[PDB]
Amino acid sequence: ILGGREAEAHARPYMASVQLNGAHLCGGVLVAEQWVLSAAHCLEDAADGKVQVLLGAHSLSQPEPSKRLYDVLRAVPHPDSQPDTIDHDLLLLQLSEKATLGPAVRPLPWQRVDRDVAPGTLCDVAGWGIVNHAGRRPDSLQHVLLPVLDRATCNRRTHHDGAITERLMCAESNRRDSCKGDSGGPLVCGGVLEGVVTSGSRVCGNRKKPGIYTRVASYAAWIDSVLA
């Protein structure tokens, strides 16, 4: 998260760190007792690494009573996701067991009704991704409020050039932005999960290249079907 602030410890009890070989790789969101939603691009290149999900965390390194590391039983990428596109970039991770629910570990309800978030609406984005242009990685969870950008402006030639489908939304990226290591984490509007961070492009914090988020409501039938 560029241009954000440290979050309040455990105020986002849905927040998950998706880990490869003991290190934070991607954000994720606890959406049911046994399932975490993240981005499909995260698991390309996992190949024989230890894939785990850290729940109940604030600091990645320091000990905390609520922190617990879970193994993944099953990972289900959306079947139309591909490494060279930004489309359908969702991943569902089934934990080895039901997560232990508590003040610091709780699922976040997600939008099932396919309606665009209105432009200008401020949405909360959180993660352990990099926090500046010198590559600094934070120890503790960061967050930022970003205004939703309307799809037609997002789709102009100077911005993302028709790439933003009805299944994607954008937010302003002017010095405040999701960045490397925030992928798969939550965009929350009205207290509900509306988006999952994705990227087509390496650039962060450039007004001309808005952040892109996969609209979970757009995949509501697929999500339900995998959760059953």
Ligand X SMILES: CC(C)CC(=O)Nc1cccc(-c2cccc(CN)c2)c1
Select the span of 8-16, 46-54, 113-121, 177-185 touching ligand X (CB under 6 A). Answer: 177-185
Nearer CB in complex with ligand X: 177/194: 177
Spatial contact of 185 and 15, defined as CB atoms under 8 Å apart = yes
Q: Is 136 in the site for ligand X (CB under 6 A)?
A: no
d(CA 159, CA 128) in angstroms, rounded, equals 26
In the complex, what is the shortest distance from the CB of residue 42 to ligand X, in angstroms, rounded to a whole number? 5
Number of residues this chain uses to bind ligand X (CB under 6 A)? 15
d(CA 195, CA 146) in angstroms, rounded, equals 12
Nearer CB in complex with ligand X: 186/211: 211
Q: Which of 60, 104, 193, 197 binds ligand X (CB under 6 A)?
A: 197
In the complex, what is the shortest distance from the CB of residue 15 to ligand X, in angstroms, rounded to a whole number? 16
> Which amino acid is it at 4?
G
- Stated as kind and residue range, the H or E segment containing 222 is helix 220-227
> How is 62-109 classified by DSSP, letter by letter?
S--TT-EEEEEEEEEE-TT--TT--TT--EEEEESS----BTTB----
Q: Which of 115, 136, 157, 202 binds ligand X (CB under 6 A)?
A: 202
Q: Is 41 in the site for ligand X (CB under 6 A)?
A: yes
Q: Which of 155, 178, 214, 218 binds ligand X (CB under 6 A)?
A: 178
Select the span of 47-55, 108-116, 148-156, 194-202 touching ligand X (CB under 6 A). Answer: 194-202
Closest-CA residue to 180 (of 117, 133, 220, 146): 133
Task: State the pairing for strand pair 142-149/122-127.
Answer: antiparallel
Binding site for ligand X (CB under 6 A): 26, 41-42, 173, 177-180, 182-183, 197, 199, 202, 204, 211
